[PDB]
Design a protein around this ligand. Structure first.
Ligand code: SF4
Ligand code: F3S
Ligand SMILES: [Cl-]
Ligand SMILES: [Mg+2]
Lengths: 595, 265
């Protein structure tokens, strides 16, 4: 046992293993120890995959890199491509034209909405929603709940909910439960009434049909989704009012954006507010982890291209829960972002040191500690005192940080309180949400009104889930504005989409280094490149789930996943309901984390 | 009864799973609820850990020789296979276990079919396509990074309707989707035939939709349904949106030179 970051870690209790962790992207193993009362007192995050993209990129053409690193992940599809072209453009001093900037922003914000909404319904919801309980719901009371939760949503009739319930009934009655097979249904960890469960399952199905429409924005500008195409110097989708982009194509994009705004406002945000309220009422405010102290994001979405002071999700770092002081974060500073491998399956010359990604090294070293139960190819209990993950350990000035929508919303709130007007909308969303969760929704449902502050509500698994939903809504609103700016710019006579001045490597400096950062759906993404004689000399990625899912560092400090599980009671230690609920609130992408 | 599908995940980026749920005809919702029984899939399944593991043996026993194994991603042979760990063991062991009693095996995407990005030089994990590991079972390759959504659901629909693998070419790809090269029916073909090419991004030729051959388009050597079926309910495809085909459905496309270097001859 040892103490770190205000957590008292203790591995003397009962050991529980969850492998595979499901309803995530990629491969993760989680182990915990629980005390005599089933409270988690130790948590261990193990990334169980590695592909070696950083190694594969060496020697290749910087202009091709985006396509390779895009394939780090098909869920957060395109965010790595964006980071890569930004990194290369930064290295080569390339400034992209306004239309390329706006199209990239629209694609980024489309990804945010798609990723967030699909995560919540198709990966996260089953941690809050009991599908079998939905079968016992009254269609009429479910209609009445829907009208209270979101009066503007037109799909609310008793008949509609009855037909959905009937389809669920016959599916279950077939004896082939598919994705619901061997579930934790009926656990006391589930608190929603039957009607809330049926509403949620109905929206699960609605979202599954709708999500395919949203990504058609990627298809127009990038050719396909998943894995739309990008370009160093701009975008390939040339404009002509026989061209990739004309007014009809832009009108199509606007129709999709308008649908997105309706979904976020009428289905997604209200569901999360309602579900959050009910779990708040149950007292389930666990999962804060590092969000209560240390959060980071690079900052994103400048109103004015290349002007970071205008970031609409302004970033930085907060330490020790002090929301009155946001420290600036510089991805170029060798003493800020560093990665350790002390407890990771890699090797450095000196593993007491953290490497900035321009100096990063990725040499695999799969080896298990002396206290392992099992063998090298048949692990029963992983040894977290030694190397236990394919995920590196990123830290900021040595501090362990949480990243993600919650981090961005805490940073936005802090910025807004200091007088940053670019963060006014996120502040508005947060204050609106707190009032709904504390007062409006309880009043509507005949529950007691509560008085939680944002400082109390946000650092929790509920808060982390809320921030994701609000961010989806904000991104939809922002790309609506971007669309108007794009069309206005084109109509004013600027049709440029690519700067080709430095396309040819004969124009390049003989060596260069660059960094590209992105507020990816799961948090702070950076790609760091060194170019030599037209080729990639070094390419290192530090990805949001690398931060959140990181194993312990040289000092033994825990990462966001491990911290978030601490001190959480489990109804039944052999049913990982609470473990999944909190882990899923980070939207873990394990392919991203390891690359 | 609906045919069980056990959808395994090796080393992957999950693009194939994502593409599958974009299908408009049929809807993925209808496939899952009314066509197959998707009994194991890490991406969507309710159960985790021991409860998820228990599903495999239950289905394999009850439906022996009568379930479909779908594989996304691939097994690594380096790091003693532990660069992809499932249930404390190498993925390759899970793959071989579930494969042994499958009626048919679908290799989804370029990862499962050929190796894709992780198998690009120098392949640090020795990522290996499914057919090089499983050599005694019928395998249909559905390559592409990812494949087109309707190609994926089209393969499933055929297999469920007919209880047969569709006719395959010599590389194991379904002829109903992979018989044409992109260049055969690419709408920019009249420009190619007339020697009308984009030569720099956003030049006048690019704004008129001229052929992308000189910008590196690998359509002339790539078999897929992209130029006709197109992407995301026929909305576009790479070439229509202005970027050359990078050859993503072809074996080893990452190591055929820069995507922006034109084909020779
Ligand atoms: S764009 Fe590519 S596929 Fe289309 S005609 Fe030109 S070379 Fe052939
Ligand atoms: S890059 Fe792939 S998606 Fe089609 S157009 Fe070429 S085969
Ligand atoms: Cl390949
Ligand atoms: Mg890295």
């Amino acid at each position: 046992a040892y103490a770190t970051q205000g957590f008292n870690l203790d591995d003397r209790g009962r050991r529980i293993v969850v492998d595979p962790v499901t309803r995530i992207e990629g491969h993760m193993r989680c182990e915990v120890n629980v005390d005599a009362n089933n409270v988690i007192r130790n948590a261990v995050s193990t990334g169980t995959m590695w592909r070696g993209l950083e190694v594969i990129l060496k020697g290749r053409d910087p202009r091709d890199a985006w396509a390779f690193v895009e394939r780090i992940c098909g869920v957060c599809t395109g965010c790595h491509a964006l980071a890569s072209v930004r990194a290369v453009e930064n290295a080569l001093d390339i400034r992209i034209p306004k239309n390329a900037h706006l199209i990239r922003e629209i694609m980024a914000k489309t990804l945010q909405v798609h990723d967030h909404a699909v995560h919540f319904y198709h990966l996260h919801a089953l941690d809050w929603v009991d599908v079998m309980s939905a079968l016992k719901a009254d269609p009429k009371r479910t209609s009445e709940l829907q009208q209270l939760v979101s009066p503007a949503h037109p799909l609310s009739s008793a008949g509609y909910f009855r037909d959905i319930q009937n389809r669920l009934k016959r599916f279950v009655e077939s004896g082939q439960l598919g994705p619901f097979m061997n579930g934790y249904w009926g656990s006391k960890a589930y608190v929603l009434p039957p009607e809330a469960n049926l509403m949620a399952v109905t929206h699960y199905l609605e979202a599954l049909d709708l999500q395919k429409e949203w990504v058609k924005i990627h298809t127009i500008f990038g050719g396909k989704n998943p894995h739309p195409n990008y370009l160093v110097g701009g975008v390939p989708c040339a404009i002509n009012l026989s061209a990739p982009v004309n007014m009809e194509r832009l009108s199509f994009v606007k129709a999709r954006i308008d649908e997105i705004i309706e979904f976020n406002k009428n289905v997604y945000v209200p569901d999360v507010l309602a579900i959050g309220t009910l779990y708040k009422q149950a007292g389930w405010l666990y999962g804060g982890g590092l969000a209560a102290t240390n959060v980071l994001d690079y900052g994103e979405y400048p109103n004015v291209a290349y002007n970071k002071s205008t970031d609409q999700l302004p970033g930085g770092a907060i330490l020790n829960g002090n929301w009155d002081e946001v420290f600036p974060v510089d991805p170029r500073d060798s003493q800020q972002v560093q990665e350790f491998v002390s407890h990771s399956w890699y090797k450095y010359a000196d593993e007491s040191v953290g490497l900035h990604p321009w100096d990063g090294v990725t040499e695999p070293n799969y080896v298990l500690g002396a206290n392992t139960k099992g063998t090298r190819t048949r692990i029963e209990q992983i040894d977290e005192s030694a190397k236990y993950s394919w995920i590196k350990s990123p830290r900021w000035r040595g501090h362990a940080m949480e990243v993600g929508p919650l981090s961005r919303y805490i940073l936005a709130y802090a910025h807004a309180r200091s007088g940053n007007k670019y963060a006014e909308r996120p502040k508005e969303q947060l204050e609106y949400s707190a009032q709904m969760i504390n007062s409006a929704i309880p009043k509507a449902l005949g529950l007691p009104e509560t008085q939680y502050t944002l400082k109390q509500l946000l650092p929790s698994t509920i808060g982390r889930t809320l921030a994701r939903a609000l961010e989806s809504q904000y991104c939809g609103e922002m790309m609506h504005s971007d669309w108007h700016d794009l069309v206005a710019n084109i109509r004013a006579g600027d049709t440029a989409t690519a700067n080709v001045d430095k396309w040819d490597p004969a124009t390049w400096p003989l060596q260069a280094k660059g960094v590209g950062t992105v507020a990816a759906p799961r948090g702070a993404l950076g790609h760091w490149i060194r170019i030599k004689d037209g080729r990639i000399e070094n390419y290192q990625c530090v990805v949001p789930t690398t931060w959140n899912g990181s194993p312990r560092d040289y000092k033994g400090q825990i990462g966001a996943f491990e911290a978030s599980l601490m001190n959480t009671p489990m109804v039944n230690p052999e049913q990982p309901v609470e473990i999944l609920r909190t882990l899923h609130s980070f939207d873990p992408c394990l392919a991203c984390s390891t690359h | 009864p609906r045919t069980p599908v056990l959808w395994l995940h090796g080393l992957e980026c999950t693009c194939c799973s994502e593409s599958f749920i974009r299908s408009a005809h049929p809807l993925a919702k209808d496939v899952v609820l009314s066509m197959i029984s998707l009994d194991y899939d890490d991406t969507l399944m309710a159960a985790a850990g021991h409860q998820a593991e228990a599903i495999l043996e239950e289905i394999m026993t009850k439906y022996k020789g009568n379930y479909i194994l779908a594989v996304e991603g691939n097994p690594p042979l380096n790091q003693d296979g532990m660069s992809c760990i499932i249930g404390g063991r190498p993925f390759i062991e899970q793959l071989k276990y579930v494969a042994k009693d499958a009626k048919a095996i679908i290799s989804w995407g370029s990862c499962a079919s050929w190796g894709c990005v992780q198998a690009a030089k120098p392949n640090p994990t020795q990522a290996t396509p499914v057919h090089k590991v499983i050599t005694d079972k019928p395998i249909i390759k559905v390559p592409g990074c990812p494949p087109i959504a309707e190609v994926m659901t089209g393969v499933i629909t055929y297999m469920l309707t007919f209880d047969r693998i569709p006719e395959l070419d010599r590389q194991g790809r379904p002829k109903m989707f992979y018989s044409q090269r992109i260049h055969d029916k690419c709408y920019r073909r009249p420009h190619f035939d007339a020697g009308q090419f984009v030569e720099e991004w956003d030049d006048e030729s690019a704004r008129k939709g001229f052929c992308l051959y000189k910008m590196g388009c690998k359509g002339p050597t790539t078999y897929n349904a992209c130029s006709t079926t197109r992407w995301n309910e026929g909305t576009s495809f790479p070439i229509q949106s202005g970027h050359g085909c990078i050859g993503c459905s072809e074996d080893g496309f990452w190591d055929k030179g820069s995507f922006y270097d034109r084909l020779t001859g």
